[PDB]
Design an enzyme around this catalytic site. Structure first.
Site, PDB file in Angstrom:
ATOM      1  N   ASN A 257      -0.514  -9.744   4.755  1.00 23.34           N
ATOM      2  CA  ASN A 257      -0.860  -7.686   4.934  1.00 23.34           C
ATOM      3  C   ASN A 257      -0.439  -7.391   3.198  1.00 23.34           C
ATOM      4  OD1 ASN A 257      -0.790  -5.715   6.504  1.00 23.34           O
ATOM      5  ND2 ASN A 257       1.067  -6.459   7.345  1.00 23.34           N
TER       6      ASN A 257
ATOM      7  N   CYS B 213      -5.163   0.475   3.730  1.00 26.06           N
ATOM      8  CA  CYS B 213      -5.113  -1.269   4.151  1.00 26.06           C
ATOM      9  C   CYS B 213      -6.896  -2.265   3.872  1.00 26.06           C
ATOM     10  CB  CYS B 213      -4.455  -0.937   5.605  1.00 26.06           C
ATOM     11  SG  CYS B 213      -5.776  -0.412   6.091  1.00 26.06           S
TER      12      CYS B 213
ATOM     13  N   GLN C 205       0.910  -0.728  -0.036  1.00 27.70           N
ATOM     14  CA  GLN C 205      -0.128  -0.247   0.252  1.00 27.70           C
ATOM     15  C   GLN C 205       0.825   1.481   0.020  1.00 27.70           C
ATOM     16  OE1 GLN C 205      -1.444  -1.252   4.118  1.00 27.70           O
ATOM     17  NE2 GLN C 205      -1.185   0.886   4.120  1.00 27.70           N
TER      18      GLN C 205
ATOM     19  N   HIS D  34      -6.604  -1.831  11.458  1.00 28.56           N
ATOM     20  CA  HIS D  34      -5.924  -2.365  10.314  1.00 28.56           C
ATOM     21  C   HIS D  34      -6.768  -3.535   9.535  1.00 28.56           C
ATOM     22  CE1 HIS D  34      -2.748  -3.134   7.523  1.00 28.56           C
ATOM     23  NE2 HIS D  34      -2.024  -4.110   8.264  1.00 28.56           N
TER      24      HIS D  34
HETATM   25  C1  LIG Z   1      -4.789   1.229   6.998  1.00 28.09           C
HETATM   26  C2  LIG Z   1      -4.004   0.290   8.608  1.00 28.09           C
HETATM   27  S1  LIG Z   1      -2.356   1.165   7.918  1.00 28.09           S
HETATM   28  O1  LIG Z   1      -2.060   2.130   7.193  1.00 28.09           O
HETATM   29  O2  LIG Z   1      -1.501   0.384   7.049  1.00 28.09           O
HETATM   30  C3  LIG Z   1      -1.388   1.129   9.679  1.00 28.09           C
HETATM   31  C4  LIG Z   1       0.091   1.491   9.600  1.00 28.09           C
HETATM   32  C5  LIG Z   1       1.020   1.742  10.822  1.00 28.09           C
HETATM   33  C6  LIG Z   1      -0.119   0.877  12.460  1.00 28.09           C
HETATM   34  C7  LIG Z   1      -1.235   0.131  12.209  1.00 28.09           C
HETATM   35  C8  LIG Z   1      -2.420   0.499  11.099  1.00 28.09           C
HETATM   36  C9  LIG Z   1      -5.840   2.284   7.227  1.00 28.09           C
HETATM   37  C10 LIG Z   1      -4.680   3.127   8.496  1.00 28.09           C
HETATM   38  C11 LIG Z   1      -5.889   4.869   8.022  1.00 28.09           C
HETATM   39  C12 LIG Z   1      -4.861   6.151   8.516  1.00 28.09           C
HETATM   40  C13 LIG Z   1      -4.630   6.496   7.330  1.00 28.09           C
HETATM   41  C14 LIG Z   1      -3.709   7.827   7.861  1.00 28.09           C
HETATM   42  C15 LIG Z   1      -3.890   8.611   9.180  1.00 28.09           C
HETATM   43  C16 LIG Z   1      -3.977   7.431  10.522  1.00 28.09           C
HETATM   44  C17 LIG Z   1      -5.745   6.173  10.170  1.00 28.09           C
HETATM   45  N1  LIG Z   1      -6.505   1.939   8.617  1.00 28.09           N
HETATM   46  C18 LIG Z   1      -7.899   1.524   8.490  1.00 28.09           C
HETATM   47  O3  LIG Z   1      -8.417   2.209   7.178  1.00 28.09           O
HETATM   48  C19 LIG Z   1      -8.850   1.296   9.002  1.00 28.09           C
HETATM   49  C20 LIG Z   1      -9.614  -0.257   8.844  1.00 28.09           C
HETATM   50  C21 LIG Z   1     -10.742  -1.310  10.230  1.00 28.09           C
HETATM   51  C22 LIG Z   1     -11.700  -1.864   9.195  1.00 28.09           C
HETATM   52  C23 LIG Z   1     -12.099  -1.963  10.068  1.00 28.09           C
HETATM   53  C24 LIG Z   1     -12.599  -2.187  11.647  1.00 28.09           C
HETATM   54  C25 LIG Z   1     -11.578  -1.325  12.035  1.00 28.09           C
HETATM   55  C26 LIG Z   1     -10.359  -0.473  11.302  1.00 28.09           C
HETATM   56  N2  LIG Z   1     -10.349   2.322   9.680  1.00 28.09           N
HETATM   57  C27 LIG Z   1     -10.084   3.404   9.213  1.00 28.09           C
HETATM   58  O4  LIG Z   1      -9.095   3.594  10.103  1.00 28.09           O
HETATM   59  N3  LIG Z   1     -10.962   4.207   9.492  1.00 28.09           N
HETATM   60  C28 LIG Z   1     -12.687   4.184   9.127  1.00 28.09           C
HETATM   61  C29 LIG Z   1     -12.810   4.647   8.699  1.00 28.09           C
HETATM   62  N4  LIG Z   1     -12.899   6.165   8.637  1.00 28.09           N
HETATM   63  C30 LIG Z   1     -14.124   7.055   8.177  1.00 28.09           C
HETATM   64  C31 LIG Z   1     -11.759   6.580   9.099  1.00 28.09           C
HETATM   65  C32 LIG Z   1     -10.794   5.829   9.918  1.00 28.09           C
END
Ligand SMILES: *[C@H](CS(=O)(=O)c1ccccc1)[C@H](CCc1ccccc1)NC(=O)[C@H](Cc1ccccc1)NC(=O)N1CCN(C)CC1
Length: 221
Positions: free
Chosen positions: A188, A25, A19, A164
């Site tokens: 992942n 993710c 990604q 995540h």
């Molecule tokens: C992916 C996880 S990641 O970026 O690889 C990451 C990196 C390091 C440690 C942990 C995770 C994304 C990241 C989102 C993010 C971007 C920028 C700043 C902060 C956060 N996470 C998601 O998209 C999660 C997935 C998810 C699905 C189901 C249940 C719980 C989580 N969703 C998310 O962060 N959301 C949901 C939608 N909402 C509009 C915004 C936040």
């Protein structure tokens, strides 16, 4: 159910993707699950477009590189009537304007199925009888970033606060005891150089470790 499952061995899983610097993710988890389900119905493994999901699913509540939900990605595919292939709609790791092209659609779903929240037994049933399952987990700990091999276990992991989205492509156990050192085989989306060739084994049947079974789902093809 089998004591071990690995859908990669049956051709349900595409190579590990990356990604890059985009919080997409959720999109990779979604395409991973859809790739597996489309394979079940057509016998053809086709890499799907995460960019298509990033650029086009804002109406469903997703925020591209700023986070999203696999469930809402599946809803987008349903409402949109299709999803393009990776080849036709390349990933650029940034939020852009929707460029979905119907002629290039290669996948669809009519909604999705939710696995009983918090039930690892239910998740096991789904993985064994359905194929790869999209799941959310608490991967915010430094221990996860530094994972390389073996069974991942983080004492501070939360089963409720997830951040995540990943893909469970199977399960099994280490050692000779089938009832010990059990784990979920997780794909992942941080490239093949991360963890174990892009994968990670998460402790299984250890009280829903890191919330692996808290928000699991699969698209209905
Ligand atoms: C992916 C996880 S990641 O970026 O690889 C990451 C990196 C390091 C440690 C942990 C995770 C994304 C990241 C989102 C993010 C971007 C920028 C700043 C902060 C956060 N996470 C998601 O998209 C999660 C997935 C998810 C699905 C189901 C249940 C719980 C989580 N969703 C998310 O962060 N959301 C949901 C939608 N909402 C509009 C915004 C936040």
């Amino acid at each position: 159910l089998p004591k071990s499952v690995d859908w990669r061995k049956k051709g349900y899983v595409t190579p590990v993707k990356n990604q890059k610097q985009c919080g997409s993710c959720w999109a990779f988890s979604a395409t991973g699950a859809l790739e597996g389900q489309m394979f079940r119905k057509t016998g053809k493994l086709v890499s799907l477009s995460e960019q298509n999901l990033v650029d086009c699913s804002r109406p469903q509540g997703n925020q591209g590189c700023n986070g999203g939900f696999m469930a809402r990605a599946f809803q987008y595919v349903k409402e949109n009537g299709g999803l393009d292939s990776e080849e036709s709609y390349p990933y650029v790791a940034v939020d852009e304007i929707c460029k979905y092209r119907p002629e290039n659609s290669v996948a669809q779903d009519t909604g999705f199925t939710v696995v009983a929240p918090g039930k690892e037994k239910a998740l096991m049933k789904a993985v064994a009888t359905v194929g790869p399952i999209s799941v959310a987990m608490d991967a915010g700990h430094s221990s996860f970033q530094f994972y390389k091999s073996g069974i991942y276990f983080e004492p501070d992991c939360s089963s409720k606060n997830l951040d995540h989205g990943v893909l469970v492509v199977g399960y099994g156990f280490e050692g000779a005891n089938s009832d010990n050192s059990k784990y979920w085989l997780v794909k992942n989306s941080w490239g093949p150089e991360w963890g174990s060739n892009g994968y990670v084994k998460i402790a299984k049947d250890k009280n829903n470790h890191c919330g692996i079974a808290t928000a699991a789902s699969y698209p209905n093809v």
